[PDB]
Amino acid sequence: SKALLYLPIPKTTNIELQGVPNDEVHPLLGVK
Amino acid sequence: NYPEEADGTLDCISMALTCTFNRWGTLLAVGCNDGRIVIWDFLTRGIAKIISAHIHPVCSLCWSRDGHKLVSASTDNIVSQWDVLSGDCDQRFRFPSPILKVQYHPRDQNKVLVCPMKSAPVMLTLSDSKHVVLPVDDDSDLNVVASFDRRGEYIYTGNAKGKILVLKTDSQDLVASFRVTTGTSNTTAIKSIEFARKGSCFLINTADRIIRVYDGREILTCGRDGEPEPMQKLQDLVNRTPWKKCCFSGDGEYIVAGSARQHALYIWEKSIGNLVKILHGTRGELLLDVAWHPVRPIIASISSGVVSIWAQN
């Protein structure tokens, strides 16, 4: 279809996942 | 060909962490640690737009097929779609754990694959904001990374015990699988899976510091619990370099891998496996990301908050 090539110068959903821990740290920033 | 010389930097005050080219290589989106996305006009190396995307550092970015949307992830577990032209947030998702990767389905930008930490991968559908949890092997609690193949017809996942699963994207049927093991036959964690923009080859980066290159067509013919042999095994036998990030050239003929220890980009010819070049950045800096331009022998790498450009200039 049509495409953006040149660049000439909100609803929030909570995703709950069973068993996924809530105290992890992103590897860019450190470790748990 | 492949770049061979340092060729300047993209000067921004925001501190760069990750970057990705749109399909045509005309724009480079750079996610920064102040939560901004800086979009560069890559043909002139001027800033085209700045999006204030997140409070906390941006850790993953992907352009949609039509170039009009960017999906981002933050280090505090948010995934957002941006309308590039307006800078508006289309919608936002909150996950329970930090996001390792986001990726649009390369042929259906209504679909976003998300890899949260210590979780199965998750497929989002944007039109209705629903999600599906993808299947996993071994244990439910491992770190799992995942990537669409070139056409998005399959999803490849890899877990911290070296298990690779190949799922049909639409049905999630498991069509093939295998386990990567070391010479010691111990397991080695899958760190990343990267596909070429042309053809059917992909690579796996593992904790044993070997980049393994395969043909996806061979993977499918080996089936479940197969033992496919890698086409190439790329590694530094002297320095035992671990790899931060790997990328194919746009025609899939070369592979670049950024060292996780020194500021060094190794470039191999894919079909022969020879090391063609090492590019050395400023001493002492840590590489965070690498991206090979989709058309030209130009590589972008991120260290010390700055995008460096390597060209054959």
Author numbering:
A (entry chain C): 396 to 404, 452 to 474
B (entry chain A): 12 to 324
Copy text from the publication.
The methyltransferase activity of MLL1 is regulated by three conserved core subunits, WDR5, RBBP5 and ASH2L. Among KMT2-associated regulators, RBBP5 and its yeast ortholog Swd1 play a pivotal role in the assembly and activity regulation of KMT2-family complexes. Both RBBP5 and Swd1 contain a WD40 propeller domain followed by a long C-terminal tail. The C-terminal tail can be further divided into two regions, a WD40 repeat proximal (WDRP) region and a C-terminal distal (CTD) region.
Selenomethionine-substituted crystals diffracted up to 1.8 Å resolution, and we were able to solve the complex structure by single-wavelength anomalous dispersion. The electron density map unambiguously allowed us to build the atomic model of the majority of RBBP5WD40 (residues 12–324) and two segments of RBBP5CTDM (residues 396–404 and 452–474). RBBP5WD40 forms a canonical β-propeller fold with seven WD40 repeats. The RBBP5WD40 conformation is almost identical to that of apo-RBBP5WD40 with a root-main-square deviation value of 0.39 Å for 319 Cα pairs, indicating that CTDM binding induces no dramatic structural rearrangement of RBBP5WD40. RBBP5CTDM exhibits an extended conformation and wraps the WD40 propeller through two segments, burying 1472 Å2 of the surface area at the interface. The first segment of RBBP5CTDM (CTD1) contains residues 396–404 and sits on the top surface of RBBP5WD40. Three leucine residues (L399, L400 and L402) in CTD1 fit snugly into the hydrophobic groove formed by residues from RBBP5WD40, including W35, L38, I50, W74, V95, L96, and the aliphatic side chain of K60. The second segment (CTD2) meanders its way around the side face of RBBP5WD40 and also pairs with the repeat 2 of the WD40 propeller to form a five-stranded β-sheet. The interface between RBBP5CTD2 and RBBP5WD40 consists of a set of hydrophobic residues, including I457, L459, V462, P469, L470 and L471 from RBBP5CTD2 and L28, C70, F106, I110, L111, P127, V133, V144 and L299 from RBBP5WD40. Combined mutation of CTD1 and CTD2 (L399A/L400A/I457A/L459A, named as RBBP5CTDM-4A mutant) further disrupted the RBBP5CTDM–RBBP52–333 interaction and reduced the HKMT activity of the MLL1 complex to the activity level comparable with that of the complete-CTD-deletion construct (RBBP52–381).
